[PDB]
């Protein structure tokens, strides 16, 4: 309150979030959707005001066309993006941007054209006194107190692999995978439907999100687990629906997370994501490979499914040559680790020296962001 609390806006494909410095997690989380007339608006009196940002738009999905301001970690349409920032400060955070400086997150290997322009909008469109751009993968490795290693980041909307050595990400070790958090929620509903439950409208899609944090589990061994499931017994697990019925989930408890590990269930011929992390290591320098195994960090969106840590150890051991130690770094606050890293180092006093200010932008121009980082 007063000095410059630091407003942090975290952007991704979906499930964006924001808060204040000194916090242990972000204050508010909202959906990333924008809607305007679709199918002529659905009948009787069309024209009105339509550009809805937030979860109010989710209900309105049938009558409004949704466009993604962010496609898999990048921004293609700026008009949609501006509405999100307006709505976040004025309606979601309910704090004036003018008193508090804003920090914006970025996807790894973010294109250069976008980087100069986002800075440009903050200074003239919202007149923000200070802002900074950070990488979600860098902060997560940073949070554990380790600068050398490889981080598998489960984003709220997109999953990126970004090995980090001395603050520098490896361009030749980074790959983009599109399954992260929101996509799994779609998937969970899809398999739930197969057993015998009715899902035909986008309105009830949101309901399975609640299901995801409470009921997503990872099995120690998938095939052995499948045999246990057929008998049922204690496998079935209770869940709460707003109406009152409880949808029982038995062998779906472990199978859902498995899609990341085993894409074949989806219908994809693509290699599993854990394997994908392994390819990055193979490409990496041989001498530091042993260090990388002891430097692995799990953070973000859907990594919080219980039993996931146990599964990771097993697959990596099978994938790895052998004869060596594999260690996984597990921070208690892994779900909020991406946001948490950004929040704390934004108000100390010596971070004042380092801020990119509005006044500086006016002088040098767009070129300034490239010049002061490292």
């Amino acid at each position: 309150d007063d000095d410059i609390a630091a407003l942090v806006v975290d952007n991704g494909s979906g499930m964006c979030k924001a808060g204040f410095a000194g916090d242990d997690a972000p204050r508010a989380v909202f959906p990333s959707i924008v809607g305007r007339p679709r199918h002529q608006g659905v009948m009787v009196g069309m024209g009105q005001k339509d550009s809805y940002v937030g979860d109010e738009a989710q209900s309105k999905r049938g009558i409004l066309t949704l466009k993604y301001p962010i496609e898999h970690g990048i921004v293609t349409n700026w008009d949609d993006m501006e509405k999100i920032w307006h709505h976040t400060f004025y309606n979601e955070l309910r704090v004036a941007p003018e008193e508090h400086p804003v920090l914006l997150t970025e996807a790894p290997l973010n294109p250069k054209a976008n980087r100069e322009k986002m800075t440009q909008i903050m200074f003239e469109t919202f007149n923000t006194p200070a802002m900074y751009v950070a990488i979600q993968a860098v902060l997560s490795l940073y949070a554990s107190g380790r600068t050398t290693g490889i981080v598998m980041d489960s984003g709220d909307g997109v999953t990126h692999t970004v090995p980090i050595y001395e603050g520098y990400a490896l361009p030749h070790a980074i790959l983009r995978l599109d399954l992260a958090g929101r996509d799994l929620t779609d998937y969970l509903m899809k398999i739930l439907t197969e057993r015998g439950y009715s899902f035909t409208t986008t309105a009830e899609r949101e309901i399975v999100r609640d299901i995801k944090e409470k009921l997503c589990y990872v099995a120690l061994d998938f095939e052995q687990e499948m045999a246990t499931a057929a008998s049922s017994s204690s496998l079935e697990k209770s869940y709460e629906l707003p109406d009152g019925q409880v949808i029982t989930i038995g062998n779906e408890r472990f199978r859902c997370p498995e899609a990341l590990f085993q894409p074949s269930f989806l219908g994809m011929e693509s290699c599993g994501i854990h394997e994908t992390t392994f390819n990055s290591i193979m490409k990496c320098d041989v001498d530091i490979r042993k260090d990388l195994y002891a430097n692995t960090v799990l953070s973000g969106g859907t990594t919080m499914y219980p039993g996931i840590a146990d599964r990771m150890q097993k697959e990596i051991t099978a994938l790895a040559p052998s004869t060596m130690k594999i260690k996984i770094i597990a921070p208690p606050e892994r779900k909020y680790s991406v946001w948490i890293g950004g929040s704390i180092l934004a108000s100390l006093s010596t971070f004042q020296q380092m801020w990119i200010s509005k006044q500086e932008y006016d002088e040098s121009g767009p070129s300034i962001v490239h010049r002061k980082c490292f």
């Binding site: 808060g19 916090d23 242990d24 997690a25 937030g54 309606n91 955070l93 309910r94 609640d210």
Partner: protein, 166 residues
């Protein structure tokens, strides 16, 4: 029916104040309006803000620790009024604020005033340009209860509506 009232500029003026907070110093953070009462003035031609009745966030620190109770006291089923209240609640990480319009439309209230109010909800929210969430009760028990405010939230991830009642 469609929209009983057209707007008198008064509601927008007070609503605008809440939207930007209109605060900087410690002196006016506590003078911010947690809740505001809206009603339609006589003849019901115009919709305005009631000077006499309002709730301040500063009150929790100043002298009253339960703003959401004072509201219950000053909202008889005997009178039908329109209100804006800030959620100001904690969900297991920290706390934010949801803008909610509180509709007080008691069935038992004097029919003459209440009937225009009931018919005017489309008109009143028409100027609200669609509002996020709403709470509506026609009796003291629904307005009094912690759970109704918590229902909006979801209720399975909220241990403390005001940091103590739940």
């Amino acid at each position: 029916m469609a929209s009983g009232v057209a707007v008198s500029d008064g509601v927008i003026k007070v609503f605008n104040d809440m939207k930007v907070r209109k605060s900087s110093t410690p002196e006016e953070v506590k003078k911010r309006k947690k809740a505001v009462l809206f009603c339609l003035s006589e003849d019901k031609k115009n919709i305005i803000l009631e000077e006499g009745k309002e709730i301040l966030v500063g009150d929790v620190g100043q002298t009253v620790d339960d703003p959401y109770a004072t509201f219950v006291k000053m909202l008889p089923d005997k009178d039908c009024r329109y209100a804006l209240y800030d959620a100001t609640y904690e969900t297991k990480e920290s706390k934010k604020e949801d803008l909610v319009f509180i509709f007080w439309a008691p069935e038992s209230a004097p029919l003459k005033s209440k009937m225009i109010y009931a018919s005017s909800k489309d008109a009143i929210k028409k100027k609200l340009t669609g509002i996020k969430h709403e709470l509506q009760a026609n009796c003291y028990e629904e307005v009094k209860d912690r759970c109704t405010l918590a229902e909006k939230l979801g209720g399975s991830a909220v241990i403390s509506l005001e940091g103590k009642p739940l």
